[PDB]
Structure 1
Amino acid sequence: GEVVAIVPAAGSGERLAVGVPKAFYQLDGQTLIERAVDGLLDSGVVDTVVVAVPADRTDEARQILGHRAMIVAGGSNRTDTVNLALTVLSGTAEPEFVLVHDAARALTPPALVARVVEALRDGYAAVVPVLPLSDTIKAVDANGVVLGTPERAGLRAVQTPQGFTTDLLLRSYQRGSLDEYTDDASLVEHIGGQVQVVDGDPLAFKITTKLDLLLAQAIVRG
Structure 2
Amino acid sequence: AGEVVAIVPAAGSGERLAVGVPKAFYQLDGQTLIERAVDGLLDSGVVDTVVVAVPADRTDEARQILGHRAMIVAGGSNRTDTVNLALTVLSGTAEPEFVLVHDAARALTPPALVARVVEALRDGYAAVVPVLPLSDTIKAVDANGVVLGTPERAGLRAVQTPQGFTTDLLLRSYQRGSLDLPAAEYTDDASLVEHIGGQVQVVDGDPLAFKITTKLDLLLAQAIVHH
Give the shorter-chain TM-score range.
over 0.9
1:91 and 1:76 mapped to 2: Cα distance?
25
- How far does the alpha carbon of each residue in 1:89-135 deviate from its partner, in whole angstroms, 9 at most, with x for none? 14211101000000000000000000000000000000000000110
1:10-51 alpha-carbon deviations (Å, 9 max, x no partner):
000000000100000000011000000000000000000000
Aligned mates of 1:52, 1:4 — CA distance in 2: 13
Q: Tell me, in whole angstroms, the C-alpha distance in 1 between the residues paired with 2:135 and 2:49.
A: 34
Using the TM superposition, name which of 170-179 and 180-189 deviates more: 170-179
CA distance in structure 2 between the aligned counterparts of 1:165 and 1:181, rounded to whole angstroms: 20
Distance in 1 between residues matched to 2:154 and 2:179, nearest whole Å: 34
Listed as ranges, the gaps of 5+ residues in structure 2 are none
1:175 Cα deviation (Å)?
2.7
Show structure 1 runs of 4+ deviating over 4 A. none
Structure 1 alignment gaps of length 5 or more: none
- Give the TM-score of the pair, scaled to structure 2: 0.97
Counterpart CA distance in 2 for 1:184 and 1:194 is 13
Distance 1:175 1:196 in 2: 23
Q: Which moved more, 1:36-45 or 1:87-96?
A: 87-96
TM-fit CA distance, 1:155: 0.3
CA distance in structure 2 between the partners assigned to 1:99 and 1:76 by the alignment: 21
- Please state how far the C-alpha of 1:197 moved relative to its aligned partner: 0.2
* Secondary structure, aligned partner of 1:68: coil
2:192 is matched with: 187
- CA–CA distance in structure 2, aligned partners of residues 157 and 104 of structure 1: 16
Distance in 2, matches of 1:9 and 1:137, equals: 28
Instruction: Measure the CA separation in 2 of the matches of 1:177 and 1:72.
Output: 22
Aligned-partner Cα distance in 2 for 1:176–1:83: 12
1:182 deviation in Å? 1.3
Other structure's SS at 2:67 match: helix
Hey, what's the Cα distance between the residues in 1 that align with 2:175 and 2:61? 30
Identity across the alignment (%): 99
d(CA) in 1 for partners of 2:109, 2:59: 23
Q: CA RMSD in A?
A: 0.6
- Deviation, 1:178, is 2.2
Aligned residue for 2:93, secondary structure, equals: coil
Question: Is residue 212 of structure 1 aligned with residue 213 of structure 2?
Answer: no
- Structure 1 distance, partners of 2:77, 2:109, is 25
1:150-180 residue CA offsets vs partner (Å, 9 max, x unmatched): 1100000000000000000000001333221
Distance 1:47 1:216 in 2: 27
Tell me the distance in 2 between the aligned counterparts of 1:90 and 1:68: 20
Q: Report the count of equivalent residues.
A: 222
The alignment partner of 1:212 has SS state of helix
Give distance in 2, aligned partners of 1:181 and 1:217: 28
Counterparts of 1:21 and 1:150, CA distance in 2:
35
Cα distance in structure 2, aligned partners of 1:116 and 1:163: 6
Q: Secondary structure of the residue that 1:4 maps to in structure 2?
A: strand
Cα distance in 1, alignment partners of residues 177 and 15 from structure 2 = 26
